[PDB]
Coordinates of all heavy atoms in Angstrom, one line a residue:
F1 N -2.0 12.2 -16.2 CA -2.5 11.4 -15.3 C -3.5 10.4 -15.8 O -4.4 10.8 -16.6 CB -3.3 12.2 -14.2 CG -2.3 13.2 -13.6 CD1 -2.5 14.5 -13.8 CD2 -1.6 12.8 -12.6 CE1 -1.6 15.5 -13.2 CE2 -0.7 13.7 -12.0 CZ -0.8 15.0 -12.3
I2 N -3.3 9.1 -15.7 CA -4.0 8.2 -16.2 C -5.1 7.8 -15.0 O -4.7 7.7 -14.0 CB -3.3 6.7 -16.5 CG1 -2.1 7.1 -17.4 CG2 -4.2 5.7 -17.0 CD1 -2.4 7.5 -18.8
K3 N -6.4 7.9 -15.5 CA -7.3 7.6 -14.3 C -7.4 6.1 -14.1 O -7.5 5.3 -15.2 CB -8.6 8.2 -14.6 CG -9.6 8.1 -13.6 CD -10.8 9.0 -13.8 CE -11.7 8.8 -12.7 NZ -12.9 9.7 -12.9
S4 N -7.5 5.7 -12.8 CA -7.8 4.3 -12.5 C -9.2 3.9 -13.3 O -9.9 4.7 -13.3 CB -7.9 4.1 -10.9 OG -8.1 2.8 -10.7
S5 N -9.2 2.5 -13.6 CA -10.3 2.1 -14.3 C -11.7 2.3 -13.4 O -12.7 2.6 -14.2 CB -10.0 0.6 -14.7 OG -8.9 0.5 -15.4
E6 N -11.6 2.1 -12.2 CA -12.7 2.2 -11.4 C -12.6 3.2 -10.2 O -13.6 3.4 -9.4 CB -13.4 1.0 -11.0 CG -13.9 0.1 -12.1 CD -14.7 -1.0 -11.6 OE1 -16.0 -0.9 -11.5 OE2 -14.2 -2.2 -11.6
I7 N -11.4 3.4 -9.8 CA -11.2 4.1 -8.6 C -10.7 5.6 -8.7 O -10.2 6.0 -9.9 CB -10.0 3.4 -7.9 CG1 -10.2 1.8 -7.9 CG2 -9.8 3.8 -6.3 CD1 -9.0 1.0 -7.5
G8 N -10.9 6.4 -7.7 CA -10.5 7.8 -7.9 C -9.1 8.0 -7.5 O -8.8 8.8 -6.6
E9 N -8.2 7.3 -8.3 CA -6.9 7.4 -8.1 C -6.3 7.5 -9.6 O -6.9 7.1 -10.5 CB -6.3 6.1 -7.5 CG -6.8 5.8 -6.2 CD -6.1 4.6 -5.5 OE1 -6.3 3.5 -5.9 OE2 -5.5 4.8 -4.4
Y10 N -5.3 8.5 -9.5 CA -4.7 8.8 -10.8 C -3.3 8.5 -10.9 O -2.6 8.8 -9.9 CB -5.0 10.3 -11.2 CG -6.5 10.7 -11.4 CD1 -7.3 10.7 -10.2 CD2 -7.0 10.9 -12.5 CE1 -8.7 11.1 -10.3 CE2 -8.4 11.2 -12.6 CZ -9.1 11.4 -11.5 OH -10.5 11.7 -11.7
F11 N -2.9 7.8 -11.9 CA -1.5 7.4 -12.1 C -0.8 8.5 -12.7 O -1.1 8.9 -13.9 CB -1.4 6.1 -13.1 CG -2.1 4.8 -12.5 CD1 -3.4 4.6 -12.6 CD2 -1.4 3.8 -11.9 CE1 -4.1 3.6 -12.1 CE2 -1.9 2.7 -11.5 CZ -3.3 2.6 -11.5
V12 N 0.2 9.0 -12.0 CA 1.2 10.1 -12.5 C 2.0 9.5 -13.5 O 2.7 8.6 -13.4 CB 1.8 10.6 -11.4 CG1 2.7 11.8 -11.6 CG2 1.1 10.9 -10.0
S13 N 1.8 10.2 -14.6 CA 2.4 9.7 -15.8 C 3.6 11.0 -16.3 O 3.4 12.1 -15.9 CB 1.6 9.5 -16.9 OG 0.6 8.6 -16.5
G14 N 4.5 10.6 -16.9 CA 5.6 11.4 -17.4 C 6.7 10.8 -17.1 O 7.0 9.7 -16.8
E15 N 7.8 11.7 -16.9 CA 9.1 11.2 -16.5 C 9.2 11.4 -15.0 O 8.2 11.8 -14.3 CB 10.3 12.2 -17.1 CG 10.4 11.8 -18.6 CD 11.2 13.0 -19.2 OE1 12.4 13.2 -18.7 OE2 10.8 13.5 -20.3
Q16 N 10.3 10.9 -14.4 CA 10.4 10.9 -12.9 C 10.4 12.3 -12.3 O 10.2 12.7 -11.2 CB 11.7 10.2 -12.5 CG 13.0 10.7 -12.9 CD 14.3 9.9 -12.3 OE1 14.1 8.7 -12.3 NE2 15.3 10.5 -12.0
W17 N 10.9 13.2 -13.3 CA 10.9 14.6 -12.9 C 9.6 15.2 -12.7 O 9.2 16.0 -11.9 CB 11.6 15.3 -14.0 CG 13.0 14.8 -14.2 CD1 13.4 14.3 -15.4 CD2 14.1 14.5 -13.4 NE1 14.6 13.9 -15.3 CE2 15.1 13.9 -14.0 CE3 14.3 14.8 -12.0 CZ2 16.3 13.5 -13.5 CZ3 15.5 14.4 -11.4 CH2 16.4 13.7 -12.2
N18 N 8.7 14.6 -13.6 CA 7.1 15.1 -13.6 C 6.5 14.7 -12.2 O 5.8 15.2 -11.6 CB 6.3 14.5 -14.8 CG 6.7 15.0 -16.1 OD1 7.6 14.7 -16.7 ND2 5.9 16.0 -16.6
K19 N 6.8 13.4 -12.0 CA 6.5 12.7 -10.7 C 6.9 13.3 -9.5 O 6.3 13.5 -8.5 CB 6.6 11.2 -10.9 CG 6.2 10.7 -12.2 CD 6.4 9.2 -12.4 CE 5.9 8.8 -13.8 NZ 6.1 7.4 -14.2
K20 N 8.2 13.7 -9.6 CA 8.9 14.4 -8.6 C 8.2 15.8 -8.3 O 8.1 16.3 -7.2 CB 10.5 14.6 -8.8 CG 11.2 15.2 -7.7 CD 12.7 15.1 -7.8 CE 13.1 13.6 -7.8 NZ 14.6 13.4 -7.8
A21 N 7.9 16.5 -9.4 CA 7.1 17.8 -9.4 C 5.9 17.7 -8.5 O 5.6 18.4 -7.6 CB 6.8 18.4 -10.8
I22 N 5.1 16.6 -8.9 CA 3.8 16.4 -8.3 C 4.2 15.9 -6.7 O 3.3 16.4 -5.9 CB 3.1 15.1 -9.0 CG1 3.0 15.4 -10.4 CG2 1.8 14.9 -8.3 CD1 2.1 16.8 -10.6
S23 N 5.2 15.3 -6.5 CA 5.6 15.0 -5.2 C 5.8 16.3 -4.2 O 5.2 16.3 -3.1 CB 6.8 14.2 -5.2 OG 6.7 13.0 -5.9
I24 N 6.5 17.3 -4.8 CA 6.8 18.5 -4.2 C 5.6 19.4 -4.1 O 5.3 20.0 -3.1 CB 8.0 19.1 -4.8 CG1 9.2 18.2 -4.8 CG2 8.3 20.4 -4.1 CD1 10.3 18.8 -5.5
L25 N 4.8 19.5 -5.1 CA 3.6 20.3 -5.2 C 2.5 19.8 -4.3 O 1.7 20.7 -3.7 CB 3.0 20.3 -6.7 CG 3.9 21.0 -7.7 CD1 3.3 20.7 -9.2 CD2 4.3 22.4 -7.4
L26 N 2.3 18.6 -4.0 CA 1.3 18.0 -3.3 C 1.7 17.6 -1.8 O 1.0 17.9 -0.8 CB 0.6 16.9 -3.8 CG -0.1 17.1 -5.3 CD1 -0.5 15.8 -5.8 CD2 -1.3 17.9 -4.9
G27 N 2.9 17.1 -1.8 CA 3.4 16.6 -0.4 C 3.0 15.3 -0.4 O 2.8 14.5 0.7
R28 N 2.9 14.5 -1.5 CA 2.7 13.1 -1.7 C 3.8 12.5 -2.1 O 4.6 13.0 -3.0 CB 1.5 13.0 -2.8 CG 0.2 13.6 -2.3 CD -0.6 12.7 -1.5 NE -0.7 11.4 -2.0 CZ -1.7 10.6 -1.7 NH1 -2.7 11.0 -0.8 NH2 -1.9 9.4 -2.1
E29 N 4.1 11.3 -1.8 CA 5.2 10.5 -2.3 C 4.6 9.7 -3.5 O 3.8 8.7 -3.2 CB 5.8 9.6 -1.2 CG 6.4 10.3 0.0 CD 6.9 9.3 0.9 OE1 8.0 9.0 0.8 OE2 6.2 9.0 1.8
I30 N 5.1 9.9 -4.7 CA 4.4 9.3 -5.8 C 5.0 7.9 -5.9 O 6.2 7.8 -6.3 CB 4.5 10.1 -7.1 CG1 3.3 11.2 -7.1 CG2 4.4 9.4 -8.3 CD1 3.4 12.2 -6.1
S31 N 4.3 6.9 -5.7 CA 4.5 5.6 -6.0 C 4.0 5.3 -7.3 O 4.8 5.1 -8.2 CB 3.8 4.8 -4.9 OG 2.6 5.5 -4.6
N32 N 2.7 5.6 -7.4 CA 2.0 5.6 -8.9 C 1.0 6.4 -8.8 O 0.8 7.2 -9.8 CB 1.5 4.1 -9.1 CG 2.7 3.1 -9.3 OD1 3.0 2.3 -8.4 ND2 3.1 3.0 -10.5
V33 N 0.1 6.4 -7.9 CA -1.1 7.2 -8.0 C -1.2 8.3 -6.7 O -0.4 8.1 -5.8 CB -2.4 6.3 -7.9 CG1 -2.6 5.4 -9.0 CG2 -2.5 5.6 -6.6
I34 N -2.0 9.2 -7.1 CA -2.4 10.3 -6.3 C -3.9 10.2 -6.0 O -4.4 9.6 -7.0 CB -1.8 11.8 -6.6 CG1 -2.3 12.1 -8.1 CG2 -0.3 11.8 -6.4 CD1 -2.0 13.6 -8.6
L35 N -4.4 10.9 -5.2 CA -5.8 10.8 -5.0 C -6.5 11.8 -5.9 O -6.0 12.7 -6.4 CB -6.2 11.0 -3.6 CG -5.8 10.2 -2.5 CD1 -6.3 10.2 -1.2 CD2 -5.9 8.7 -2.9
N36 N -7.8 11.5 -6.1 CA -8.7 12.3 -7.0 C -8.8 13.7 -6.4 O -8.9 14.7 -7.2 CB -10.1 11.7 -7.0 CG -11.1 12.5 -7.9 OD1 -11.2 12.5 -9.1 ND2 -12.0 13.1 -7.1
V37 N -8.8 14.0 -5.1 CA -8.7 15.2 -4.4 C -7.4 16.0 -4.9 O -7.5 17.3 -5.2 CB -8.9 15.3 -3.0 CG1 -7.7 14.5 -2.1 CG2 -9.0 16.7 -2.4

């Protein structure tokens, strides 16, 4: 996860499968970032 330069948003990094994993685990649609929480 790449942290935003000043914001509490983290850019989900990896392959689309990593990002899809994060999508399912959180219930977030990964565009680019997820929240700090």
